[PDB]
Design a protein around this ligand. Structure first.
Ligand SMILES: CS(=O)(=O)Oc1ccc2c(NC(=O)Cc3cccc(Cl)c3)cncc2c1
Ligand SMILES: [Cl-]
Lengths: 305, 305
């Protein structure tokens, strides 16, 4: 029993965190096999950041311009290349702590653990979701660039995010491990704004199913809805549209609790109209959207209370 | 920017998690040097739990009755003893991954990271506080017994909790690493209830300072109060008393934001008698009490491990 926002154990990832220095700039890199991955903006000055020509800045660099530090050991850089917005530094030693890994690009609504690092040293781990506007609501300070987001499904680490920048509203933007940004963002200090954010509807529904499994039923009602009527109402509250794919994904939780997805959708429409009335759901006074349907099944028991 | 509930990197602890089997029971153990620590109830059947005589049950066991598994390796048990509610199993091999460690007993209000394990395998990491009623609001399933709570002090791991049981309300009870329970609980299948819980006041104040640092100032007011006047309000809303020690501990956050502790207390006083009025603080509609003053300074300064 109990439901917590839970991150994956960060051990396999901590053993990959290195410090990357290029001139006066210092950020974090990810050491996998004989390659160190880091944001390509490590080669820029603050004066270059407005309109950088990364290809032109990179061609002017040599392997000895990059200082890579793993704990108290200097790693020797023997090659450098760029893949989209990520810089790949070939080193002379394969990381003996390299876990079984994959590079995965995630869709909005998906969750992951972030190992926040400063100077190649892990300082904290937290759980978060890729927002529908492609930003992440992280907790990042100066020097956190290069920190990674991951999922550890079974014994394999799947890397899905690398931190690059903070937008003016305090939210964060980054890339997958192939250097492709999530969202309409660029690694430039030009004016960039995150689009209007919305609530991840399928995730709130999954969290309502988790509350039912944990014994909370006060919000349930005798109503059901069409999928279209649910969307007309939910979109008025800045909720993401619920697709037929989302309904299918909630199928196992619906089977386990005995509450059809469109029946749970009717509880949600009521919650958005009535508020909580001083009540809480799983210790929260807001509807929680950073738990996917897969997270709920993984965390929760197979017997409803 | 950003403020998240963040756990310590779990790496140093994951390297200590082992599986302990005694007959039909399987739970987790902590392997430090040549000793494996686990709950003493691992030696009990379900009938034994009703009223156990642990010394009598233990004297009937031999070293070969305990199966200890570290990854895919069988550890040889060469001795067994009991310290309060923890069983200590002497093994032939010292853990090569043993970090620098301490065993510490924490006070209610202090926070820690929990590495939830099943079959000696870490599956999740979350942050939580020792409640004033000595229970922890964890997220635990069957087989999580023996999972540990910890903090990191520079490069030293401070072990403060070992999971033993779940109370009927879904909250959890456990011991320090010396086998001494937190709270008026016993390791026995019998009726046990958690006392009425209170809010950790100094922690809410620290979380209000974190909101100010992050730009949330709507709750600030021109007013100030006294420790006497405030503690009358605190008693009335089931809040823990605020001591002069708590005021001193909040000193650095007070200096950084320019809001005196009794000035922040008058904001908390108003939040209790009037509510949030549809507003949120750090994305929350409730006053958060699971972040200590040290946690806030650490997350707003970028301390690494
Ligand atoms: C005082 S503060 O604002 O919280 O400190 C920061 C500073 C930089 C932060 C940072 N790095 C950048 O945004 C630098 C940058 C600039 C323009 C383009 C690009 Cl691709 C990168 C990432 N995360 C949190 C950050 C907090
Ligand atoms: Cl995805």
């Amino acid at each position: 029993s109990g439901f917590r926002k839970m991150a994956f154990p960060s051990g396999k990832v901590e053993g990959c965190m290195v410090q990357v220095t290029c001139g006066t700039t210092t950020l974090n890199g990810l050491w996998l096999d004989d390659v160190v991955y880091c944001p390509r903006h490590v080669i820029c000055t603050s004066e270059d950041m407005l309109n950088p020509n990364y290809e032109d800045l990179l061609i002017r660099k040599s392997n000895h311009n990059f200082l890579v530090q793993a704990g108290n050991v200097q790693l020797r850089v023997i090659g450098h290349s760029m893949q989209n917005c990520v810089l790949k530094l070939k080193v002379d030693t394969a990381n003996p702590k390299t876990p079984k890994y994959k590079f995965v690009r995630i869709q909005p609504g998906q969750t992951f653990s972030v190992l926040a690092c400063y100077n190649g040293s892990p300082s904290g781990v937290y759980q978060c979701a890729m927002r529908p506007n492609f930003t992440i609501k992280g907790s990042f300070l100066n020097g956190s660039c290069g920190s990674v987001g991951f999922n550890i499904d079974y014994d394999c680490v799947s890397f899905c995010y690398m931190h690059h920048m903070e937008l003016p509203t305090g939210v964060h933007a980054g890339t997958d491990l192939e250097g492709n940004f999530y969202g309409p963002f660029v690694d430039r200090q030009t004016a960039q704004a995150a689009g209007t954010d919305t609530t991840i509807t399928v995730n709130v529904l999954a969290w309502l199913y988790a509350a039912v499994i944990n014994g909370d039923r006060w919000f349930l009602n005798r109503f059901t809805t069409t999928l279209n009527d649910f969307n007309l109402v939910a979109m008025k509250y800045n909720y993401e549209p619920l697709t037929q794919d989302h309904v299918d994904i909630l199928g196992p939780l619906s089977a386990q609790t005995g509450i059809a997805v469109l029946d749970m959708c009717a509880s949600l429409k009521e919650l958005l109209q009535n508020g909580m009335n001083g009540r809480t759901i799983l210790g929260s006074a807001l509807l929680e959207d950073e738990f996917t349907p897969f997270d709920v099944v993984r965390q929760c028991s197979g017997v409803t209370f």
